[PDB]
């Protein structure tokens, strides 16, 4: 039995840390909602 | 029922376990299907019943139809509002990449958080939720990339 607990407002943070790259990927999405690489 | 980001918890396992995250907006709770498998949810002494969902999109809404309709502009940085298990909410800014599919392009964020972070919202600069984090793929070098998964309003 699952339950929910509030964790915060949904807001943009002006001085957030910036990270992560920006990959361009060919993918397929199957009937089960799972992504795979092509 | 206040707007905002919520943890999705279960006690059916040892202690209390965070299975995911979701977004309350306009009286509707939004999360990824794989987090709840479409089960009912408790909020305090109240109950949230599923209203819409779709395994292929990997999304589910509770108490009403899917309300989130903002979309990545394809150009600008976004923020993941990561709510990791046992940890405070934190904003992470990134320029999305792109999932290219036979049915068109989807934004994707190259950020790796525990599975229980699934359902955390991705935001544009206006604070609008452009999709949810947690349905993705592992790329050649072993790292994880999440689609920016958005429903239809
Ligand atoms: C455990 O299942 C998972 C986990 C992550 C994402 C998806 C599923 C199923 N469809 C998308
Ligand atoms: C605690 O597990 C991990 C593992 C990888 C990345 C992150 C965490 C937590 N936040 C970022």
From TrEMBL, chain B:
Domain of life: Viruses
Coiled coil, from the record: none
Active site: 34 (charge relay system), 58 (charge relay system), 118 (charge relay system)
Subcellular location(s) of the protein: Host cytoplasm, Host perinuclear region; Host endoplasmic reticulum membrane; Host nucleus; Secreted
Domain Peptidase S7: 1-153
Quaternary structure note: Forms a heterodimer with serine protease NS3. May form homooligomers. Interacts with human SPCS1. Interacts with non-structural protein 2A. May interact with host ANKLE2; the interaction may cause defects in brain development, such as microcephaly. May interact with host SRPRA and SEC61G.
Function per UniProt: Binds to host cell surface receptors and mediates fusion between viral and cellular membranes. Efficient virus attachment to cell is, at least in part, mediated by host HAVCR1 in a cell-type specific manner. In addition, host NCAM1 can also be used as entry receptor. Interaction with host HSPA5 plays an important role in the early stages of infection as well. Envelope protein is synthesized in the endoplasmic reticulum and forms a heterodimer with protein prM. Prevents premature fusion activity of envelope proteins in trans-Golgi by binding to envelope protein E at pH 6.0. After virion release in extracellular space, gets dissociated from E dimers.
Protein name according to UniProt: Genome polyprotein
Species this protein is from: Zika virus (ZIKV)
């Amino acid at each position: 039995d699952m339950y929910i607990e509030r964790a915060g407002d949904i807001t943009w943070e002006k001085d957030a840390e910036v990270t992560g790259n920006s990959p361009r990927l060919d993918v397929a999405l199957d009937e089960s909602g799972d992504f795979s690489l092509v | 029922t206040t707007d905002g980001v919520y943890r999705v918890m279960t006690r059916r396992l040892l202690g209390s376990t965070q299975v995911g995250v979701g977004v309350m907006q306009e009286g509707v709770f939004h999360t990824m299907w794989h987090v709840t498998k479409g089960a009912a949810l408790r909020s305090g002494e109240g109950r949230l019943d599923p209203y819409w969902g779709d395994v292929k999109q990997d999304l589910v809404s509770y108490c009403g139809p899917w309300k989130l309709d903002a979309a990545w502009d394809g150009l600008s940085e976004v923020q993941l509002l990561a709510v990791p298990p046992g940890e405070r909410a934190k904003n992470i800014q990134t320029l999305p990449g792109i999932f290219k599919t036979k049915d068109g392009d989807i934004g994707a964020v190259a950020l790796d958080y525990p599975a229980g972070t699934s359902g955390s919202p991705i935001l544009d600069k206006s604070g609008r939720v452009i999709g949810l984090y947690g349905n993705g793929v592992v790329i050649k070098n072993g790292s994880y990339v999440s689609a920016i998964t958005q429903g239809k309003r």
